[PDB]
Design a protein around this ligand. Sequence first.
Ligand SMILES: [Fe+3]
Ligand SMILES: [Fe+3]
Ligand SMILES: [Fe+3]
Ligand SMILES: [Fe+3]
Lengths: 202, 202, 202, 202, 238, 238, 238, 238
Amino acid sequence: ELKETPSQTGGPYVHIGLLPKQANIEVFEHNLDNNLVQDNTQGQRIRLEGQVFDGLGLPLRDVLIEIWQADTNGVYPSQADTQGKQVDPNFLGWGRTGADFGTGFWSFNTIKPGAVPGRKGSTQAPHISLIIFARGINIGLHTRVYFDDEAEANAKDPVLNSIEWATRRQTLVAKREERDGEVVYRFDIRIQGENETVFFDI
Amino acid sequence: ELKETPSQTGGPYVHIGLLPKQANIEVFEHNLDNNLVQDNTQGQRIRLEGQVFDGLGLPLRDVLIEIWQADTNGVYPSQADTQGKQVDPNFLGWGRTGADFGTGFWSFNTIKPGAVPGRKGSTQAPHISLIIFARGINIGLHTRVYFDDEAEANAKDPVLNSIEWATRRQTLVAKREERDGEVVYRFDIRIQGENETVFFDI
Amino acid sequence: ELKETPSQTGGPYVHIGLLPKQANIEVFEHNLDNNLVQDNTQGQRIRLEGQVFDGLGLPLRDVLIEIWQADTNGVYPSQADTQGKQVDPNFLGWGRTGADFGTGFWSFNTIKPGAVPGRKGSTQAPHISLIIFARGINIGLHTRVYFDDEAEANAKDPVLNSIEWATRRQTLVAKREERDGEVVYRFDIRIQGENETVFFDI
Amino acid sequence: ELKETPSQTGGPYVHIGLLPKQANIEVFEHNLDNNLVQDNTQGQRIRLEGQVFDGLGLPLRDVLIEIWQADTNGVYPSQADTQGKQVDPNFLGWGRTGADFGTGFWSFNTIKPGAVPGRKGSTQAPHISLIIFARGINIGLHTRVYFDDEAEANAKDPVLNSIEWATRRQTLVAKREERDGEVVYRFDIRIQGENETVFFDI
Amino acid sequence: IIWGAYAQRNTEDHPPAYAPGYKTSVLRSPKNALISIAETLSEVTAPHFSADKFGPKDNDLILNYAKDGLPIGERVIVHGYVRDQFGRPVKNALVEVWQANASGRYRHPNDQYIGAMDPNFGGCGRMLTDDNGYYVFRTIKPGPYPWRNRINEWSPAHIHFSLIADGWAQRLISQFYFEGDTLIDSCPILKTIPSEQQRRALIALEDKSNFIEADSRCYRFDITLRGRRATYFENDLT
Amino acid sequence: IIWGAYAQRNTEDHPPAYAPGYKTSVLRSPKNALISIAETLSEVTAPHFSADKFGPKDNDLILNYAKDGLPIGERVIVHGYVRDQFGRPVKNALVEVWQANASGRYRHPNDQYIGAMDPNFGGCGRMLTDDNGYYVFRTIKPGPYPWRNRINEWSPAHIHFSLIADGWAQRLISQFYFEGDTLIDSCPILKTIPSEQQRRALIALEDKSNFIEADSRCYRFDITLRGRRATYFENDLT
Amino acid sequence: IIWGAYAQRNTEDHPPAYAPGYKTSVLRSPKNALISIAETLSEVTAPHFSADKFGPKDNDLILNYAKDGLPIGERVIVHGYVRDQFGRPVKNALVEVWQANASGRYRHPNDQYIGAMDPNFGGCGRMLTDDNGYYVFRTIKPGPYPWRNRINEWSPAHIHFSLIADGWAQRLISQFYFEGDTLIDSCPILKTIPSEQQRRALIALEDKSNFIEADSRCYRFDITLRGRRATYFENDLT
Amino acid sequence: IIWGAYAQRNTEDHPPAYAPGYKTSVLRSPKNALISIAETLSEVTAPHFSADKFGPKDNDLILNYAKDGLPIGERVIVHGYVRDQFGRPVKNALVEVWQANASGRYRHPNDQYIGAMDPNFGGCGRMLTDDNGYYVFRTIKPGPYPWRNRINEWSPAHIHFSLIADGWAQRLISQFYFEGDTLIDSCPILKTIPSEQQRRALIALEDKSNFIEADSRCYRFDITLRGRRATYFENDLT
Ligand SMILES: [Fe+3]
Ligand SMILES: [Fe+3]
Ligand SMILES: [Fe+3]
Ligand SMILES: [Fe+3]
């Protein structure tokens, strides 16, 4: 048997290899980005946005974020999904973005996911899986984003219910807002301190 | 090559060797103290005072402090100063004091320093270099004292500008007050916790 | 990774395994020999002959020689040839012979090869690759045979031009003669001494 | 005690560091060269020229040569000379040149040296010390140049007489010629083979 | 074969989040322990990237940014295999890399080092591993990079990399170094990894038999990701 | 010679600020990492003290506080050299020392141990190093000191010292021990230093050839401070 | 996969041409160094031999020359694998072997040793490796051979072999010995190889599990040839 | 002090002239042994070069050829001491150096490697040692250089140097390498030196305390020349 290659921080120039346009490097014709909605993509369009804060309460202006999620019917666009259902064919399920160098805001244009089966016949509440990489962070931090308008499903979700300190569950619930007709979910991440966001070892 | 001798805390009786009068030891005719102003010393006289606080918000009543600074024209009274300027001849540039055993207040009678050249043609804002030694502190803690009435020079200072978390810069700015005709700068140092003072590795 | 098996001299009885008829051993129905021309083989027939001389100027009477060459159109009869051209189908491209035990003469009945592509778009002059094995020789010696009637192509050949001592290039040029209607190229090889034949590490 | 740093060949680009103008590198204002005669230099002007040949009888077209010699009165322009005599003040005593990349010819414009004291009260015949560096040469080769018109002094020279194989002494004697009023000494060096030039371990 | 969950990440084989010698980790590390969960479909799936979208020079850092000439520096090929912890090849995984140029300078707005920028070098590439888990790219060997952790901090020459493979749980970012660089023993980021054997797992080896004469040297570097266990009894994933 | 900056302090050669085995460091250590800066004139200069102000017995702890008689205890001379990390002597540096008496008792209002006070011993001295970086003082060997870290904590015999030299960056306070004291292996303050070789750098060695017959023993103790690099190209200090 | 050139021959892994202890090499070795060239199509191609031309007993040295009875001597099978230096099997390579009989006598006009000739043994065979690079032949173990290098020179028992494979550059002739023969440490031809590990690479190992009861012993001997590198960028061969 | 002759060159501490693994030495090495002579004034004297003729950037390979910008590559300072074999400093010796650029490319008409030329780098410098025998220069670390000895020969990164000092007998040309380069163990030119300890004498060491923050690394390399014996009895030189 082999040991996993050890993780190392992505460092402050992680944009060069993962978001070259942000480092002002035009080298690729097709650039991976933060827009998961294609013209024929099914589902309700939503914008996910927030900032990442360090232990002094300041925003990380060099953080890179990625999200992985299911389609509107709760099917992952991956060969590893075993539901035997057809996935939306115009949906990658993944995106990557970086916080703005001046303000630290980040966002994704995506679709609200459908519920996905949990273990042993359970049903998970709708969620987006999210990972954070940045200078100072030695191993990407995994967390999940749930939606405040899914109170009912959240209360029964297996993962949220497996966090024994119940006051911490709320840090994983994003707030729904409606900016000029658009549905926006605000999710701020606090790496350290009061109201520290729950991070998982997955 | 040799390695630097390792540091060790000065401990609670550091007064015996460095401020014997405070430990009630009369052994030396000339005792080093906290008064940097001699009768013919040039410049505006100021008093620098404050307390040092531990992580519970309590004052260290056994801390020893030293300051090193330039004269009124920004020249250090040291052979290592390369400005080619004449330094005030009645100015040592250094002093040592200990906090009061009952209240923890410390102070120095000194002169406000002039601006000193920074690296590569820059100009540093007026500052005093300060070091703290005490029981519990394994290596003396270096910090700097800037003056709130030098807003203009502070904003352009190379060292303050090299602290990337900008909210922390204010911990190095002492507040000007005027006690019965005397100019007093209050500088409290917080070793741990909220508003922790910036410490440098120089 | 593995290291190549080390070479060892073929020794004086190399005929037993490689030219049994010369050692008077009739064991195989099909014996590999020195005649590369089959009845339908295309190209101009030529005889290649010479002797191999040691450092005293004496002929090796126990040397074994092999040649590898392209067909009349410069295509090798090997799956590794990448020209995308059809090779003469009645041509092996290889032969083996041994010097006569009494005189040391050796010869091959073959065809004059066509020019073969060199590296990076160049064209090599017509040549035959030749290797020598014998007692006293620890590693087979590789050399090449060029033709004196191809002056023009020889002058531009990449390999001949990569020999920086230019007087040595001539040792690789065989002399054309015409014995009673047959075209014969004489190529003598001098292993050591004045006019030593160039040997390559290929 | 320390061991001498080991020698390594100068390689084929030795001109870059030692004769930059020959590699077409203009970087220095003052370039060391092969002209030892300054306007006020005393003595008879002579040109020293030749080629360096390898074991195939071919010229080295990448060899670098340096000479060291005394002035017209046999005094070295070095603080280590102990004769107590005044040396010509307009004479460096050293020069460096490289063979022409196409022909291999090299030359120096210099002065004919005067006789220098040998060991134990002897007198050496006039000579120039010469060293050769080039790709293929692992340690610079030292030799000496004597003059054929100094037959008398050559016959009594201590160094030439210390070569026990007397036929080899002649390889160190350069031939005087007179090109259109100029005195030229031809000295060819043969590194290997018949008439191999004597090399010293000094 | 019915796949179950990925084997647990062995936290002792990786750096801790809090590593005071690497200064920026002090305010960017959680104070709480990570909450371990049992895996679901969310953790074992991942996206698929098609080779169709990739340009022909995407894995050629020597030419993909070259405008007027070639970049200055040491021409090297880096290749290897990506496998899971059970030794199975990782097929069609997305590998993204980035690095400084031959001066130790990054092409990034926040890098202001005096080491010179190279107008013909960009510093980023990507490729998909093949069916044997194999990858190969070519580049300029980066120069060691000075930075401010302690003021005179220098990292050894390195290439950053990222992998997105079969399961989200496998998501990984790290960096590799080149055999023999003396700065490897002083790097405070490398020292966040606890064991010596894991530190050596980030060193690419000189691969002399694969050097290309009068052209390029070659380094060999293999990557290991978490692997899935096979299930033969109850399948609880769903 | 144009001097540039002092070489960086090697943080691995010193104790960390936070060392939980030394209890008072828990609330007196910063939570943030130190901010490293590039040096300026402020960091490379330091004050000058003239020998003129020093009394004749300032380096004689045996006599500088003696009133009715001599202090009780082991008469010892301590001497050595102060050098920078490049081996250059540190000239005219101010060395200040302080210690407990032969009972392990300090002359300080906050020390209440039952070990007896000595009416003829003060416990402090000072001296300036000479042009070779040499220093010498005489004293009473201190006794081991009990204190409350864990309740039965005992430190080995030691002398505290402080140095103010050529550059403020060199500012240092530490302490040395005496060869062979068995308490050296149990001291939690000594254990804050990470490496064994640095812990041994605080041990003064018995110097038998310098003992003075029927008078005093002698210990040899050398101190190393940070050193400045020389500059041969751009001089950025100013 | 587009193949580039064969990896360079490592001259340190082979005997030098000039080896004075092997006397006939003194006048049969070039005085000039070999001229290395970059490979072309001429060096990477080689002929193809069809199995169709081979007789059924071509790899059976025990029967291929037998007339009135079986040859006298030790019945042995030799088998192994031929691989390139990257471990890939060498398919359909021509292997030719020759050896002395059980007396150490060669069937050759120039061999006049008193060891007896065997009317039923010839001493030559050949075979093509299969798709796994495997070969197998059967023979009589040869006896050690006396010869005149120094007058009392004796070579250990050995079988000479030759390989013609995929590229002319791979062309090779060598010989293997049998495990434990004490003459291996004295052979001046074996001593022309510089390193001990390469000398051991010519020793066939006893393969006890493959012995055939009441019939024949077995030796295992693997051969490694030069290997081609794969090309992923410019293809300069043509 | 009256100086006598230089100590004899120890031929076992240097490469032989004939070294067949370095191919061009085969026709450029004498067949005859060198003739040793007793030294005279010719061998113990040497020229004197005045610092007056040297330009200000002669020891700054980073700036002495820079036209439009800085050269691309790793900024390094190399310094050390030149001493004779008796440890005495070599004063005012002329040191000349030359090297390839960061691509392993030399600025020379006969170098045609594909590694890119750098319009701002020349590759040559010079300096005179000071009265302590000290030297210092700055440059771009050269890249390893491919060449044709065997076709895929690669030399480790190196800087060539030459010394002209007090006596002609001291005349020397060699080259140094950088600590940790893996190509050092394969270089056939380095292998011409017989002993391992002399091979290590050509390796410049990383000098971490002399690195200049956010600017340049530093290597330490000392050179030893032949030394003169002192005479106390008969002085036979003249
Ligand atoms: Fe990096
Ligand atoms: Fe104490
Ligand atoms: Fe044999
Ligand atoms: Fe070189």
